[PDB]
Amino acid sequence: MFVTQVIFNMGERAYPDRARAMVAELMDGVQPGLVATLMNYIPGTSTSRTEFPTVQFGGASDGFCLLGFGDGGGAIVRDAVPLIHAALARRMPDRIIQVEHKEHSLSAEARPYVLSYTVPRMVVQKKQRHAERLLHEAEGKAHLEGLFLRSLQRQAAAVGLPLPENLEVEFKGAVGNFAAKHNPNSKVAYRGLRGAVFDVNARLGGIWTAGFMLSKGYGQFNATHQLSGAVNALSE
């Protein structure tokens, strides 16, 4: 029902993957339970869970942000943020780290017409053949709409939010593509989409997640702020 978003103001835009790597690195050894809980690890092992992650990372314009889902997510972010703040203060002795703590109510109500919803970061590259299928809407709609529907239903079930039984979505398109890597020296990269616009006949309150593999910082979007239509101020 409640989503907690915490932003650490480091002063520079850090990509979410390196952010998660470094926050893992800072908490090595001290308070192992916090590390296991924050990294989405099975108790007793360091492996991650295939299930939807309750721990969330995102790329803030001024830094990186922690997102908790549900009471468990809220509780973990609440007892976690002082520790990561202390670690960041320890590592960066000559910079002030600022913490912004804001909560979003999560609500999804139906609506007999559609609204323009978009995201900056979709994980859509599965096969190279499907990548060229985006020229025709009909061929590429099936897997994209299926991905959106499954992502929405699984995140709703994870957060326990009621959703209508009659959601239909049609895709519009994206702005461009981008490449992302595990490490700067890694030779493995994936393709995402920026401005992937799709129309849904329902309202989405608060911040929302779509796609899969979200903990590394993909598929987060504030649907509520997008409805304000502040995307007009994009020019040079």
Partner: protein
């Protein structure tokens, strides 16, 4: 002897009504639960009966300044601006009990409970100051009646009368003022600013962690308070029970020097500033652009001057003395 003072305030008047009333956004009094809620400080109001061009009498709230506040304002203005310089010229020192009694009507919370000798009663009542207010350990009835600052309004016609109907205001005269409280944490962006702070950025981050961990109070507070809007005209009514010339002159001097004092509340925000527009003495206007002056008022000023240049602290120390 009735005194009516036409007061126009050039800054909002803020007399806080006791109690934690809560407001939402867009100024809804006592909002339905669930919406955002913030503590609102309501301005002091008195319910009065008035007919709003309907003919039926009904009780409606009216934002006023309580009469006790105006009485204390008159007392303080008189003391600071008239009596205290007179005592300082003669280098006469008031005892601590005398000072407390003159400034709050009593030197302690325990009244004496016994009456006064007649000579002492008349001596204290004939005094230019103590006669007006009275008080003391043994209770004394002052000569001064101070009424509340009633705003001239369609709700005040049944109270003040139709004499000042030309200055009435139809709509409401209260507004909500919103205030914040910002932490220093937001305005730190560089350690160069924090060169004045102990421990530097490390200590600052430690303090912010303490704030997020165990403080909850904290230095962040969004709140609001209701103020009476500026420019509304007020009527102040003062009555005296058979005064001497010196007491009337003292009251007139206090009215002359009253404009230098605020009415109530909002010292930080310059609230309570006013200008005395018209002073009426027994149905006759004695006010002048300079102030309270004229041939009809010369005798009062002469009498109060003759009382001031020859007064001492003996009366005050006798008045404050307790018989227990």
């Amino acid at each position: 002897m009735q005194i009516e003072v036409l007061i126009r305030n050039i800054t909002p008047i803020f007399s806080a009504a006791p109690g934690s009333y809560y407001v939402s956004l867009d100024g809804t009094i006592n909002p339905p639960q669930g919406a955002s809620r913030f503590p609102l400080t309501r301005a002091r109001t008195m319910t009065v009966v008035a007919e709003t061009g309907d003919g039926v009498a009904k009780a409606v709230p009216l934002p006023i300044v309580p009469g006790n506040t105006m009485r204390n304002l008159l007392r303080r203005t008189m003391l600071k601006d008239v009596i205290e310089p007179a005592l300082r010229d003669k280098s006469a020192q008031l005892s601590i009990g005398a000072y407390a009694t003159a400034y709050a009507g009593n030197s302690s919370g325990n009244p004496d409970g016994v009456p006064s000798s007649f000579d002492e009663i008349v001596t204290m009542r004939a005094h230019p100051f103590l006669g007006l207010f009275g008080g003391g350990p043994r209770m004394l009835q002052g000569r001064l009646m101070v009424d509340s600052l009633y705003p001239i309004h369609q709700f005040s016609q049944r109270i003040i009368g139709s004499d000042y109907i030309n200055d009435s205001i139809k709509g409401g005269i209260t507004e909500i003022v919103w205030t914040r409280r910002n932490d220093p944490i937001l305005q730190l962006g560089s350690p160069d600013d924090a060169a004045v702070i102990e421990g530097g950025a490390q200590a600052a981050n430690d303090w912010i962690t303490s704030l997020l961990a165990t403080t909850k109070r904290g230095l962040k507070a969004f709140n609001a308070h209701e103020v009476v809007i500026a420019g509304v005209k007020w009527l102040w009514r003062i009555n005296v029970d058979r005064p001497s010339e010196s007491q009337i002159g003292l009251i007139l001097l206090a009215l002359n020097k009253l404009a230098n004092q605020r009415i109530a509340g909002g010292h930080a925000k310059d609230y309570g500033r006013f200008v005395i527009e018209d002073v009426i003495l027994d149905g006759e206007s004695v006010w002048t652009p300079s102030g309270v002056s004229g041939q009809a008022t010369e005798q009062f000023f002469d009498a109060i001057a003759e009382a001031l240049d020859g007064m001492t602290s003996s009366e005050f120390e006798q008045f404050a003395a307790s018989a227990k």
